């Protein structure tokens, strides 16, 4: 038990789920039809991979997951594609008309027509569980479904499942990849209405994933497939602790004890290494010391900010592959002297370490080189408030003129909901400022 149900909402979520679940199957030796040759307990089992996969009596390993989108085009590619056999048809849910980059349509208008059906389908997965731990929610900040329907869902799950944990993987918008003019509005609106209901949320700046693919994989104009295949490795590093046996494996809830000092301060900075092309990795083995040092190079962050001009409240290192305690300890000692790591005066300055032995895999015909070891750092830095700042400014520029606000008011929202949300964001920026201040 300790089961974990994944919900993928809107295109971004759905497409990142395809990446994530493809990757999980390659990590656990699961085939596209769902069969696991290495699994000897037919029909059920109490294994670590069973946290993400249930088993049928026939031996099909089925993701504990739901895919929702308010229009069929993106989910229809799952329904006809390589892993169509992996999912039961009722895990894949669609409407006919999308939310049209409108939080109002995703949360209310189109959203209220399908919410009950979704919760009914989540509930059928929950009843397969003997000891449900919580939910992982994959969505974009920018989209109408990704913002609006997610918020609606998060509120409703808080009702049906009380305080049972809910983690987010949020895709923070950036103009390099597709963006719309109103994504700042949707971003602030969903971040406000979800903040009470999310226990921990890993933001992913598309610009950050864009720059990394360009710089490190030498990809000229990265596609969503490029970005999602990188993202899913970061998602896999965080969830690896839940899916694998391990002597030196720290569970993801134990890291969360350290990562969340107050409930609103639940936004960790993910940083991953190595991201390297097959061309460059040839005759080039990257040690524990090298990949650990890369975690403090801010060009490897999932979110663009500067931790060096902020303050740490937590530092966690999630190694996978050929790693042992000794080297990690040497590597951290090196870093402590040579690098710009200031903690707040109220937190202890240790680094919390976990290690999985199962080494990191890659998607066949991918861009990432196969490496022997890897690491995902999860830090709680005040610097991440910079992401809220950049987004809050864009919100303010349009809201000053009420630009596009009629599309939201047309679908039933009030102007009060914008200012209410924005003031919550103003408070959140002030909270991240207050925690950094020294005590008296």
């Amino acid at each position: 038990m300790r089961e974990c149900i994944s919900i993928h909402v809107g295109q971004a979520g759905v497409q990142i789920g395809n990446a994530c679940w493809e990757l999980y199957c390659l990590e656990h030796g699961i085939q596209p039809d769902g069969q696991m040759p290495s699994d000897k307990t037919i029909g059920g089992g109490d294994d670590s991979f069973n946290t993400f996969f249930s088993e049928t009596g026939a031996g099909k390993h089925v993701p504990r997951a739901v895919f929702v989108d308010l229009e069929p085009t993106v989910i229809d590619e799952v329904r006809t594609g390589t892993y169509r056999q992996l999912f039961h048809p009722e895990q894949l849910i669609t409407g006919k008309e999308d939310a049209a980059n409108n939080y109002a349509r995703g949360h209310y208008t189109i959203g209220k027509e399908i919410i009950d059906l979704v919760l009914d389908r989540i509930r059928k997965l929950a009843d397969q569980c003997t000891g449900l731990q919580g939910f992982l929610v994959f969505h974009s900040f920018g989209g109408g479904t990704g913002s609006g329907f997610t918020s609606l869902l998060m509120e409703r799950l808080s009702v049906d499942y009380g305080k049972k944990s809910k983690l987010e993987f949020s895709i923070y918008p950036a103009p390099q990849v597709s963006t719309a003019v109103v994504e700042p509005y949707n971003s602030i609106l969903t971040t406000h209405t979800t903040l009470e209901h999310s226990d921990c949320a890993f933001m992913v700046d598309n610009e950050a994933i864009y720059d990394i693919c360009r710089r490190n994989l030498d990809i000229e104009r990265p596609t969503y497939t490029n970005l999602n295949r990188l993202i899913s490795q970061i998602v896999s590093s965080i969830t690896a602790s839940l899916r694998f046996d391990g002597a030196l494996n720290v569970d993801l809830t134990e890291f969360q004890t350290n990562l969340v000092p107050y409930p609103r301060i639940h936004f960790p900075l993910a940083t991953y290494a190595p991201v390297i092309s097959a061309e460059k990795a040839y005759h080039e083995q990257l040690s524990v010391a090298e990949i650990t040092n890369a975690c403090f190079e801010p060009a490897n962050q999932m979110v663009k900010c500067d931790p060096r001009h902020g303050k740490y409240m937590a530092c966690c290192l999630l190694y996978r592959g050929d790693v042992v305690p000794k080297d990690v300890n040497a590597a951290i000692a090196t870093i402590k002297t040579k690098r710009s790591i200031q903690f707040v005066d109220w937190c202890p300055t240790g680094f919390k370490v976990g290690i999985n032995y199962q080494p990191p895999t890659v998607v066949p015909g991918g861009d990432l080189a196969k490496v022997q070891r890897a690491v995902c750092m999860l830090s709680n830095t005040t610097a991440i408030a910079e992401a809220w700042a950049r987004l809050d400014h864009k919100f303010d520029l349009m809201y000053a003129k009420r630009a596009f606000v009629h599309w939201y008011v047309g679908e039933g929202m009030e102007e009060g909901e914008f200012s209410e949300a924005r003031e919550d964001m103003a408070a959140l920026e002030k909270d991240y400022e207050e925690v950094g201040v020294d005590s008296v």
């Binding site: 209310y108 808080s158 009380g162 305080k163 039933g412």
Partner: protein, 67 residues
């Protein structure tokens, strides 16, 4: 100490329940306030289109009643 042990777990339930209650209600307030607002918008839109028809009946009578 025994009565304090029960006072803590009762409080743990109380606030867990209270969070579900005020979430459940705050969501109901929004979905009702929204549906009222959305229909208020579509009722005013249709009332301006129904006012256009009554004007087009005054124009069609001013042709007939000017001969």
């Amino acid at each position: 100490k025994r009565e304090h042990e029960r006072e803590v777990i009762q409080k743990a339930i109380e606030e867990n329940n209270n969070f579900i209650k005020m979430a459940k209600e705050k969501l109901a307030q929004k979905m009702e306030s929204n549906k009222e607002n959305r229909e208020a918008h579509l009722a005013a839109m249709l009332e301006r289109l129904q006012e256009k028809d009554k004007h087009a009946e005054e124009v069609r009578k001013n042709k007939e009643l000017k001969e």
